[PDB]
Design a protein around this nucleic acid. Structure first.
Lengths: 43, 101
RNA sequence: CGAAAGGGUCCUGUAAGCAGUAGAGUAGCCUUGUUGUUACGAUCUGCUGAGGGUAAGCCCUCCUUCGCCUAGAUUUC
RNA sequence: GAAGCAGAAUUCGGUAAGCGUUGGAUUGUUCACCCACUAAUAGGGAACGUGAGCUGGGUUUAGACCGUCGUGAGACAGGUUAGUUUUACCCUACUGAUGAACUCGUCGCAAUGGUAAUUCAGCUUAGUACGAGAGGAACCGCUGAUUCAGAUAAUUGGUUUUU
RNA sequence: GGUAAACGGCGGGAGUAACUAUGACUCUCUGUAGCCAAAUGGAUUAACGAGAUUCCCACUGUCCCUAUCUACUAUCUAGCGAAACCACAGCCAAGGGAACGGGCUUGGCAAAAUCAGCGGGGAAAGA
RNA sequence: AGGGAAGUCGGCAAAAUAGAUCCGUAACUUCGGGAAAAGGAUUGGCUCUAAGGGUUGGGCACGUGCGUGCGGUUAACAACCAACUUAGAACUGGUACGGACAGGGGGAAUCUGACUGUCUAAUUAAAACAUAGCAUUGCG
RNA sequence: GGAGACGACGGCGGGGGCCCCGGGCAGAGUUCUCUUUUCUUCUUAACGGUCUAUCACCCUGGAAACAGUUUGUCUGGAGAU
RNA sequence: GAAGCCAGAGGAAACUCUGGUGGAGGCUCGCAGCGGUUCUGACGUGCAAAUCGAUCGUCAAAUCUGAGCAUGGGGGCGAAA
């Protein structure tokens, strides 16, 4: 909701578009735009 | 102008009635029931800016102060000053009354 | 039988015009304000559920009017 | 009809085509499998033993790009994009509509052709039969609903050139 | 002899006895956000597009499931008036070896003259 | 009507949006843009109020309408004339107020070509061609 | 040597014509009511004379306390006001 | 709403910020024009041997267009189909 209000992802009546914001976040997570990695197991 | 004036009289496009507006103004419990029939996070301005007379939510306090200067808000004020039409007025129009003993 | 009309039944929504100590305000003339007054002025109120329409696939009318009538032509064990 | 088939729910089989056999998702794909509703969501033919209804894939004229091959023109193991057939007034069939000859008309008959209904639920039986218990029927009687069929406009919606 | 070293070939790195091309013969090879670079480490490129694709909100007769209204046709009349196509013609069933019948055989049947429609068949695609 | 893509290969078609004033506007970016992004508030009539202009015109002493020598910047005043915008307020009708007409649907992404432009008149308008930039070759 | 003799675009100013407003003469229309109303004609050529009209140029003079000036910042001791 | 310009607030200065002015761009919405994207469009012995309707692209320029002239088939011309 905060990301939708910040980025203007609003529906009719100012309702936040959590659906579209979630799709944007998932696409950013897949396409190398948010840093994340799985740490290697220690020997 | 009115958005989608073709389907303006559909039941799914209905707006709150004036007698309900007077009852909300007179008693905060009726207004609280109407507000509990909604979801706060999906309202303009998180439900914080509400005009009871227009029965309408607004995105900001300056937007509410803005619509108050407009003529629709003044039409609602003059309609509330005249008084909305109720079943008591309907019975008085035909001379009918209720006998409770 | 037909054309009008009348009544009913429906539809819309209160005609034209006139009037009004209704009307936000503005401007003149004087009693310089005491509906001061006169003038204009969206609208409002009254006359006014009034005005308009009504079969064209609505109803009634010997007893509300005006017309029309026993044809013409063709055919036939 | 048979089965440890108590009841309930079934399973195997027989006569039976009268009557039904649905709504959706999914094309990084042999589009086949999932989901639910339901009484049930059975399978085929009349095309595919070539073949003018409409419209998507096999599918492929001319423009274009990538991959493979080729010195090249180009061709393909391939992948993608965009792209011209446009009757009916004829005969027959079918659906309706008239009709000559028998004077005109009214009331009828019925050969022949067609043919129609279907499924579920609820009340009662009855918490009964049966059952250790959990559970749990049916016949007769009554009332609705599903699909189909034939009408109709009192009412409710819709439609407005009643301009 | 030198190369645009273009095409092309091209697993490296050491040695040597060859001694120059070609060598040849052995050896053995596997930071939960840094450092270094002249703020940045980029093609995961902005704007632009009658280019191709997936989705969301709104929206609605796309659909459930169709109904109704208008104008112009189609229709009927007066006038005017073609063309395509046409061996002959047109109801079916079964058989008619060459997997084809409209004409043959055997049956069902079968009654003048017509009008509006329809798209099964025959006709109909500068097919 | 009710539902709102359940239709269809595919939201094809239609509907929805639309003028103007005001509030407000993200990621990304070549820093120019994106952008009218997105999302909101309002708009009729009537009666008023306010603001925004032009032209003309100064007192003495002499000579005689001008020349001087003075004196003054409250003309910050009078007279005359004139047109269109903008803002503010009250009153008032309403189912409608850009009342007809006119008039962006919007957003999240991917592929693709830099863009503007051009071509297969009579089936293909495009990732095709051209373009600026870049690189190579030849010629005194 | 000049004229003939020269691009495209932007805003600004002058002039003609057209459009618009007011008064007047005459005519026409409207007129239940209202409307001193609505509408129509009111024009002036080529060719000439005369008086004038941005730019620019000339004379006096010598400008900082810089000035003049366009919607648009150009001009001035190479002489501005 | 690009340069250029004016004013104010700062800054030792170079510059920074704010409000105007200005009117650039093979920029943009869009009328005409030019073109020709889409529609189970109309039309299909048509109005037409390529037309009609709606929609769409572009619209100050690599824009549209006339007349005169030049290039001629083993050719020309070709932002190349």
């Amino acid at each position: 909701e905060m990301l939708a209000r910040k980025s203007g992802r609003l529906l009719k009546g100012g309702e936040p578009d959590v659906d579209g914001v979630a799709k944007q976040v998932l696409n950013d997570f897949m396409r190398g735009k948010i840093p994340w990695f799985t740490p290697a197991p220690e020997p | 102008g009115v958005f989608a004036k073709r389907t303006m009289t559909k039941t799914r496009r209905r707006l709150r009635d004036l007698d309900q507006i007077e009852r909300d103004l007179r008693s905060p419990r009726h207004l609280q029931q109407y507000k509990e029939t909604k979801a706060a996070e999906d309202l303009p301005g998180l439900g914080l800016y509400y005009c009871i007379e227009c029965a309408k939510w607004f995105e900001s306090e300056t937007s509410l102060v803005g619509h108050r200067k407009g003529k629709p808000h003044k039409r609602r004020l003059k309609q509330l000053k005249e008084g909305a039409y109720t079943h008591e007025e309907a019975m008085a129009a035909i001379g009918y009354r209720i006998d409770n003993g």
